[PDB]
Design a protein around this ligand. Structure first.
Ligand SMILES: NC(=O)c1ccc[n+]([C@@H]2O[C@H](COP(=O)([O-])OP(=O)(O)OC[C@H]3O[C@@H](n4cnc5c(N)ncnc54)[C@H](O)[C@@H]3O)[C@@H](O)[C@H]2O)c1
Ligand SMILES: NC(=O)c1ccc[n+]([C@@H]2O[C@H](COP(=O)([O-])OP(=O)(O)OC[C@H]3O[C@@H](n4cnc5c(N)ncnc54)[C@H](O)[C@@H]3O)[C@@H](O)[C@H]2O)c1
Ligand SMILES: [Zn+2]
Ligand SMILES: [Zn+2]
Ligand SMILES: [Zn+2]
Ligand SMILES: [Zn+2]
Lengths: 379, 379
């Protein structure tokens, strides 16, 4: 039995910013009060994992185990835990649900007051609630990431940072609900609030963006324009519901102007699922006057964001954003697992590669080289 | 009998940017097809009139007759006019309602496709439909402003740029519905969509801001924080519904942080009724995470706008704006005139000064020195 014992296992550690991850042996401490130790079965790479370890990102403590998109099995539970037991299938959640704070009590948001670093949510939850870490490597502490740290074979999370899911769930596919799918799909349905018959633009056709295409389609959009600088993403996008696909590099005319001409005035809903100043600007610019909606999802390390003028809003734009697709994490994720079982949406289309966890650096290369959508890493 | 005849009258002309207005004798041509010539009875000064003739403002054609906040009486109508007749009391409208375009047909906006300059609406409608002007001075054409040009004793507007109002209306007060009151009041009700029990921050306590205070109160706000760099505005704001008033200059701590501490996390709805980079930043920053709403109203000549990071929206903010308070102009303004007759809101509180039109420069001085809210100018 490993219950109550330190577990020695493999993890991918970022020792410092701007360097590749290193496979190391780590010690994972037993869970304390209101914590759960999880054996990670499958985990995938989100662009956020790469962003936060970039030298241009500020506020992350090193050394760190990143990873936030996974599915696993409960190995053990700490004192006071009643929501899961050993053997349960679970999805670790970076978006907590304490159920008691003013944000958790509101139907208007899926934010939780546990996240106090509002200027940079991705740099919060590097320590457990008692302000210590459950990871050790080479006699020193290793920080958590986003309350999840799924690039370790065993991780420890708070009991409000996981969802118990169906016992028959495919752990090699539902891990995608841990961030990318849920974010894109939910951004369209919950944050953007895409309406039947509307026109949509989705910038960036990766894991999040393809999921936003699926979300727009489920919401009843009549036209869905996919935008990517990689035209190889277009066949998948059209298969998942994109009616049009455009590469900004194909014309000297700025993409927002191409979109405005094509739609005769702009789209109803734009979603930026790529990130950075240029995509933010194009996403806002391509929306119709009167009632145009622009939803920000993507982020870029060292970006200076977007300069906005009041006239751009005065003509009738709304700007908003998403955190984990607007889903109340602990309640919604098990329902999304059931939806997937019932074939409500196509998760398998997101998976382009499957590797052993040892080849985690290849997953980074595939992503940075634009060759993958989601790579599933198997421990 | 002036019908069909050129009218000679007084107007205040801006000959070039950055100079005071000059009272001149101008010739006003008769109205052509689908136009109405109006005798202006009372007109007031909105900050926008000063902004557009500032040297830092780009895209206004000179010489020009500004003014867009007025009430008057119809002197004559051109061919095909079915909506007003000589003698009718009217409010000229810079926000047209053509009723044909995609915007007019939508309940989601009060924009009209007649305004084609969406990057700067204030610089459109300097000419009539046929691309000519009805004003002449010293043998040369003088441009219109915002389709209204109310700083001339007689002006000519299209038949979709005015509202017929109650015969019993007080023209020296309902002129305020021509921009400032309607914008602030409507921004709270229509654009921000202030909800019962909510907390609000209104930045800038002039004509627009005090009207936003009145709007927030009417919408059921339980707390209304007024912000101004001029503390003399606070007695009026509190009288009209402000529960708290703050001057940013009183503490070294940034005003947005003072507001966050005071409300324990920020307000539900912020409205920027001042304008510029500083107020836009403070308005966005002071809003709660989760569901904070920031509405931009104010503009500043030569402003560099606001740099926004996607994280500021990801944590659950919405940003929007107002154009003339979200009112379908021609339909809503007569109803607002009736509301005023029925004492629904306090327009008189907005009037601090009344002057003959000859002293128009004093009205600018009062505004620029911060000594007025609205000055009524009487022809
Ligand atoms: N806000 C949230 O809660 C949340 C959640 C998940 C991911 N994210 C962020 O969402 C973004 C997307 O994540 P992902 O894992 O799908 O990334 P990804 O790398 O899988 O896909 C990004 C796509 O953007 C495209 N792209 C890059 N530059 C572009 C440009 N200038 N114009 C058009 N397309 C461009 C790339 O070619 C790629 O196909 C990332 O910035 C990530 O950090 C945010
Ligand atoms: N968007 C629209 O449809 C619309 C309509 C009407 C007016 N406007 C704009 O709204 C703004 C308000 O117009 P107004 O006529 O009421 O102006 P105003 O000059 O009468 O009032 C502005 C108030 O803002 C205050 N102020 C200035 N800087 C401030 C700061 N940093 N913090 C807090 N308060 C500050 C001033 O002291 C003043 O009391 C102007 O920018 C005007 O052009 C927009
Ligand atoms: Zn992610
Ligand atoms: Zn909570
Ligand atoms: Zn105005
Ligand atoms: Zn119209």
């Amino acid at each position: 039995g490993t219950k109550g014992k330190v577990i020695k296992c493999k993890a991918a550690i970022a020792w410092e910013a701007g360097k590749p991850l290193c496979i190391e042996e780590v010690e994972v401490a037993p869970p304390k009060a209101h914590e759960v130790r999880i054996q990670i079965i499958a985990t995938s790479l989100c662009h956020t994992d790469a962003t936060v370890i970039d030298s241009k990102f500020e506020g992350l403590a090193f050394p760190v185990i990143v990873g936030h998109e996974a599915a696993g099995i409960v190995e053990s539970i700490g004192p006071g835990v009643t929501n899961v037991k050993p053997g349960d299938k679970v999805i670790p959640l970076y978006a907590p649900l304490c159920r008691k704070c003013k944000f958790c009590l509101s139907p208007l948001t899926n934010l939780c007051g546990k996240i106090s670093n509002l200027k940079s949510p991705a740099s919060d939850q590097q320590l457990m609630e008692d302000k210590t870490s459950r990871f050790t490597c080479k006699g020193k502490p290793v920080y958590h990431f986003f309350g999840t740290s799924t690039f370790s074979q065993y991780t420890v999370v708070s009991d409000i940072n996981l969802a118990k899911i169906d016992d028959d769930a495919n752990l090699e596919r539902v891990c995608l609900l841990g961030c990318g799918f849920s974010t894109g799909y939910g951004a369209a349905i919950n944050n953007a609030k895409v309406t039947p018959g509307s026109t949509c633009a989705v910038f960036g056709l990766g894991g999040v963006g393809l999921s936003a295409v699926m979300g727009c389609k489920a919401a009843g959009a009549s036209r869905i324009i996919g935008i990517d600088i990689n035209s190889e993403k277009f066949v998948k996008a059209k298969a998942l519901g994109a009616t049009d696909c455009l590469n900004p590099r194909d014309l000297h005319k700025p993409i927002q102007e191409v979109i405005i001409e094509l739609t005769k005035g702009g789209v109803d809903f734009a979603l930026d699922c790529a990130g950075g100043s240029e995509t933010m600007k194009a996403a806002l610019d391509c929306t119709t006057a009167g009632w145009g909606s622009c939803t920000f999802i993507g982020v870029a390390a060292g970006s200076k964001g977007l300069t906005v003028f009041p006239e751009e809003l005065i003509i009738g734009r709304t700007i908003n954003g998403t955190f984990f697709g607007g889903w109340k994490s602990v309640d919604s994720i098990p329902k999304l697992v059931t939806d997937y079982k019932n074939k409500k949406f196509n998760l398998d289309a997101l998976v382009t590669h499957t590797l052993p966890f040892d080849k985690i650096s290849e997953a980074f290369d595939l992503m940075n080289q634009g060759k993958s959508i989601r790579t599933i890493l198997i421990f």
